[PDB]
Design a binder for these strands. Structure first.
Lengths: 92, 91, 131, 198, 87, 34, 152, 152
RNA sequence: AUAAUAGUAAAGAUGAAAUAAUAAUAAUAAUUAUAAGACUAAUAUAUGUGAAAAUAUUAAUUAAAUAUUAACUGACAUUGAGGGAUUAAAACUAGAGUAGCGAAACGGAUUCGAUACCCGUGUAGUUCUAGUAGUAAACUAUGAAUACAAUUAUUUAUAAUAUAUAUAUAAAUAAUAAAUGAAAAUGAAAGUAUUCCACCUGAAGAGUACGUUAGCAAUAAUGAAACUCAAAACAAUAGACG
């Protein structure tokens, strides 16, 4: 009670999660956008969409594998194009 | 007065070059921009919910080995320590 | 074998925060002892608001007094200790994890092991200095 | 012997080093050895590397890490040009205390730590070129890069108008500075002081 | 750590290499009208200081406005960058 | 050939329909005391 | 023993911005400088209350209310135009005296709008009194299963 | 039996090794320039417990069945060996597989649906037999000696 | 789902709509609060671990599974007819449970028709417990074992070095050489060889009939012939087509 009324709600001075982005008043877009980042960086949004229709476990595993493969080629492609750019720059 | 994204501020310690003093350079740098990573049984920290709090997307989520980039064993033991810490009251 | 119990006890004494915690620390102990087994290292971890409001016995404990006891007993006594714990209304979220000593004759508490240490005999000469 | 020949090969005279050719890390000491080529070889497009350097390169100085690599090319950056910074240190004419030179001027089984001037200086500390040095012009960072070496600008009185005169082009503007002195922290980093004549 | 060699491909071209060109400048102008017409009503007493812009955007050309060279760079620097074994 | 395998499917399904009709005859007077 | 003592604290504007409809709900916390004027409850008790102060919906609003009906209740116009009403109402009911937090939930086309509307012009007089934005999308950790895949 | 322990720790060696400390402690002080006071009994009480704990912390009644087995295989090898050391003799190998075959079995007599470890028990049995079959093809005398010895 | 609460008129679903016990009994949304079940995000590559089924929420116990030396054993093996053991999803027999899902069912859509796709309820079942049964594209469509053969890059295990380096080993994964191959392609095997087991000998009829065994049953295994054709199948190619 009193002993903790002083407790500045110690609790809520760092109590919640990352699902929050205090707004620096003034700029509002940025703040709202700051959430767009967290949201789009904890994949929260996309997961909701997935957790809508559950495919057979083998089917979802296959999909996951395919996604992984796609990811790995994209960064393999990126690596290749960076080398190509370097070669262009140098003279090769 | 000027914006940040346009003015390298090499510390004096370094070796500034004629190009180094250029925008190209600024762009270049951007492009090319951990006691656990050191080698301590990440599982031993099965409690200390402080240490584990680090490699965490701050959403009760561990990270793919694209960010954490910890050793397979280190990351898996860190993940196990986080999961074990969930069992160990704190975190 | 060597076990560990990072249990989180509840508190009610606006006054003493380590009342029950200590009282339970006695209980568990008394029994870890009267049964062939050595208590080893106790490392009061004090208090830390629980990340979530952990409702125990419909009390919704938003905080708990973490504590740790490094002990050693047969499976049964170790198993039995689990039973005691969950079934102790005071404790809120218990846990006994193993500490195999196959390699190191004496193992420290998980905590010190992440502090760089590894053994009590080590952690003792670590303080021995004085006399 | 084949090996004897290679053991003296200029290719091996150059040690190996896989340090990145971008090194975004703060730089104090050089990372690789520049390969100098006589203008002749440049037209002959010869650089002594595993593969010939592309005509696109028109410098006579390049730095290489991989004679050749899986990508079927040599990993080199034709931007090797430290030749300028170190020479400018000579253009600046200032010696380094180098802590205490017990017996040997640089003093010190292996002198890995406190390597010394680091080949940035091989001249007697005291000389009369000091005659108040030679107020070498430097590019004020706010600190002032003199001859590729930043030196903290010092002055009898703070002159804001001087900074206002160059506005945001303080680094673009170059002011002569009577270098107070420089020093090589064991991490091979030179710390120096400038004399803003404003 | 970083490392991801690819498998041989017909060619490592790039899809629609996105060079980036601003959205029909007019499209932004017409949009702001409806970004200041939703409120304040049609031809907002404020939008006078707006339609002034969407005027000539049309006029002669109702649509004020009715590349890249990486594919060859790729075609030429792939049979070199790809770490294919010998043959 | 998958199409050929699918035909088995049509044939097994057809036989399953016959089995259902045969199932009526099964467990009946024929399979009891006879 | 005291009697109710209510001094609303912050104001909460919440919404479930789903695909087929968008909802906005303005609520107000509630409090009392009395809970602790009683020695019967233990110290813990009080914080529990504080940690989770009560709450009262003050302006339930859904796209359809503003006019749209059926499919349309899922588009953008709806939200942009079913937000203003919400805000406009926070004004008339004289509810802008203390801070307000936002909690965009789910991701129907409406979320963006209610976020445009807050920032742009119709949010103006309100935005100002908003503290921290946030979010409460509900994702499940396995949990229960979800519809088969509509072979749409 | 009571007082047994792990990793070669016969209680006697403990009694004699623990004892070494007694001799050492006192004799450390005999020399130098420090006198003898509380060390008249060095807390017989404290040392008595020290050893005691050691015993609880090294008592098979408080260790792991695996450890009891580590002891056993030895016992058997040493009852079936051909000479000090031999650990490859068919009977030694058989005897060793025997100890386990039991453990494994009592294990299965609880986890009746554990099948993988059931495959194990069997493979072993099939295996012991295979080596036992070899010894009856070699030192036949030994074979029968051994089998009747192990109980088959 | 269920009250508590305050709030108002729609809610919800779809291509768009209908309905149902949706909501003027005050709904949905909100926020608290009880109860009941299933499941287990990231990490997470099924990397891996398992004989194969399978298998990534946490811990406890039990058990198996590693490398390298060292001591021993002394060919004790290679794998195998038959047999035995395990064996996904569905199904079944008991007993409990039953949130969500969802055969069947019934209703609403759409459509020319719609016993479908779409949508609303939603029962057998999906869960556990003890069983039973023994089949899957149980697929790497590739039986097991041993000896051997040309490179590279990554994992990575691991010894070593004068750990943090560049080295020697293995192991896996990815590109290939040779070789093989109807080609697709295989790549330390689909190569070079040796050993052992299983199985095939045109298509239909047919894994059907019948007999026999096993099962509570559905069924599972075993498994013919007559009749009729000069067909039937696969990889590579053009071309037409979507």
């Amino acid at each position: 009670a009193e002993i903790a009324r002083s407790s500045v709600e110690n609790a809520q001075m760092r109590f919640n999660s990352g699902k929050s982005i205090i707004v620096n008043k003034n700029n509002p877009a940025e703040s709202f956008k700051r959430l767009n980042r967290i949201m789009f960086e904890n994949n929260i949004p996309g997961d909701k969409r997935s957790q809508r229709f559950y495919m057979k476990p083998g089917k979802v595993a296959e999909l996951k594998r395919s996604q992984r493969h796609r990811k790995e080629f994209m960064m393999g492609f990126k690596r290749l194009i960076e080398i190509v750019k370097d070669a262009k720059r140098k003279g090769y | 007065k000027i914006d940040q994204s346009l003015s390298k501020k090499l510390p004096k310690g370094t070796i500034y070059d004629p190009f180094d003093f250029s925008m190209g350079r600024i762009h270049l740098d951007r492009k090319y921009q951990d006691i656990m990573k050191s080698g301590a049984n990440p599982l031993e920290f099965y409690a200390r919910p402080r240490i584990l709090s680090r490699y965490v997307t701050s959403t009760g989520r561990i990270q793919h080995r694209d960010i954490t980039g910890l050793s397979a064993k280190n990351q898996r033991r860190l993940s196990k320590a986080i999961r074990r810490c969930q069992a160990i009251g704190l975190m | 074998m060597l076990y560990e119990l990072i249990g989180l006890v509840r508190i009610t004494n606006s006054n003493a925060p380590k009342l029950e915690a200590k009282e339970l620390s006695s209980t568990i102990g008394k029994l870890i002892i009267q049964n062939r087994g050595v208590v080893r290292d106790i490392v009061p971890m004090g208090i830390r608001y629980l990340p979530k409001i952990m409702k125990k016995d419909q009390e919704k404990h938003f905080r708990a007094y973490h504590f740790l006891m490094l002990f050693d007993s047969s499976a049964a006594v170790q198993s039995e200790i689990l039973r005691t714990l969950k079934k102790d209304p005071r404790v809120i979220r218990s846990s006994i994890v193993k500490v195999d000593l196959d390699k190191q004759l004496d193992r420290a508490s998980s905590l010190h092991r992440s502090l760089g240490k590894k053994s009590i005999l080590e952690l003792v000469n670590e303080d021995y200095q004085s006399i | 012997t084949l090996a004897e020949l290679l053991g003296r090969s200029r290719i091996a005279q150059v040690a190996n080093n896989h340090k990145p050719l971008t090194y975004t890390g703060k730089k104090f000491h050089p990372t690789h050895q520049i390969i100098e080529t006589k203008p002749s070889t440049l037209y002959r497009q010869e650089w002594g590397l595993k593969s010939a350097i592309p005509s696109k390169i028109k410098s006579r100085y390049l730095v290489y890490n991989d004679l050749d690599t899986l990508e079927r090319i040599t990993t080199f950056e034709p931007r090797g040009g430290t030749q300028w910074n170190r020479l400018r240190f000579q253009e600046m004419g200032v010696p380094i205390v180098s802590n205490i030179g017990r017996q040997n001027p640089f003093f010190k089984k292996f002198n890995t730590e406190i390597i010394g001037t680091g080949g940035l200086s091989y001249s007697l500390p005291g000389k009369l070129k000091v005659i108040q040095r030679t107020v070498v012009p430097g590019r004020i960072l706010n600190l002032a890069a003199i001859g590729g070496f930043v030196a903290d600008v010092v002055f009898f009185q703070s002159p804001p108008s001087s900074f206002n005169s160059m506005g945001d082009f303080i680094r673009m503007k170059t002011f002569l500075f009577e270098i107070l002195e420089a020093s090589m922290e064991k991490n091979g980093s030179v710390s120096m002081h400038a004399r803003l004549l404003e | 750590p970083p490392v991801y060699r690819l498998p041989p491909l017909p060619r490592l071209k790039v899809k629609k290499p996105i060079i980036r060109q601003e959205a029909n400048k007019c499209l932004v102008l017409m949009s702001n009208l409806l970004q200041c017409w939703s409120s304040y009503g049609h031809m907002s007493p404020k939008c006078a200081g707006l339609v002034t812009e969407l005027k000539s955007c049309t006029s002669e050309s109702a649509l004020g406005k009715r590349k890249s060279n990486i594919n060859y760079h790729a075609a030429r620097l792939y049979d070199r960058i790809n770490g294919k074994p010998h043959d | 050939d998958s199409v050929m395998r699918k035909r088995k499917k049509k044939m097994k399904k057809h036989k399953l329909r016959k089995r259902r009709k045969r199932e009526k005859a099964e467990r009946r007077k024929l399979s009891q005391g006879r | 023993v005291y009697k109710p003592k209510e001094e609303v604290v912050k104001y909460i504007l919440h919404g479930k911005f789903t695909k087929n409809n968008t909802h906005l709900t303005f609520s107000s916390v509630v409090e009392d400088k009395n809970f602790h004027k009683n020695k019967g409850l233990t110290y813990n008790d009080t914080m529990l209350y504080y940690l989770n102060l009560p709450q009262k919906v003050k302006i339930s609003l859904s796209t359809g209310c503003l006019g749209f009906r059926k499919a349309a209740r899922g588009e953008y116009e709806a939200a942009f135009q079913t937000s203003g009403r919400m805000f406009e109402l926070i004004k008339e009911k004289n509810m802008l005296n203390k801070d307000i937090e936002v909690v965009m939930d789910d991701f129907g086309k409406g979320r963006a709008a209610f976020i445009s509307a807050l920032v742009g012009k119709e949010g103006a007089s309100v935005v100002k009194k908003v503290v921290k934005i946030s979010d409460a999308t509900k994702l499940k950790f396995g949990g229960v299963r979800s519809p088969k895949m509509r072979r749409l | 039996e009571p007082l047994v322990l792990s990793k070669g720790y016969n209680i006697e060696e403990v009694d004699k090794f623990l004892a070494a400390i007694e001799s050492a402690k006192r004799e450390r002080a005999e020399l130098s320039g420090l006198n003898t006071e509380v060390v008249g009994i060095e807390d017989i009480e404290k040392l008595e417990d020290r050893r005691e704990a050691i015993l609880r912390i090294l008592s098979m009644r408080n260790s792991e069945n695996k450890n009891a087995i580590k002891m056993a295989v030895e016992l058997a090898r040493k009852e079936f060996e051909r000479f000090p050391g031999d650990t490859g003799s068919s009977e030694v190998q058989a005897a060793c597989m025997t100890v386990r075959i039991q453990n494994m079995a009592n294990h299965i007599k609880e986890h009746r649906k554990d099948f993988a470890n059931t495959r194990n028990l069997r493979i072993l049995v099939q295996q012991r037999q295979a080596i036992l079959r070899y010894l009856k093809r070699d030192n036949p005398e030994k074979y029968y000696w051994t089998i009747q010895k192990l109980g088959l």
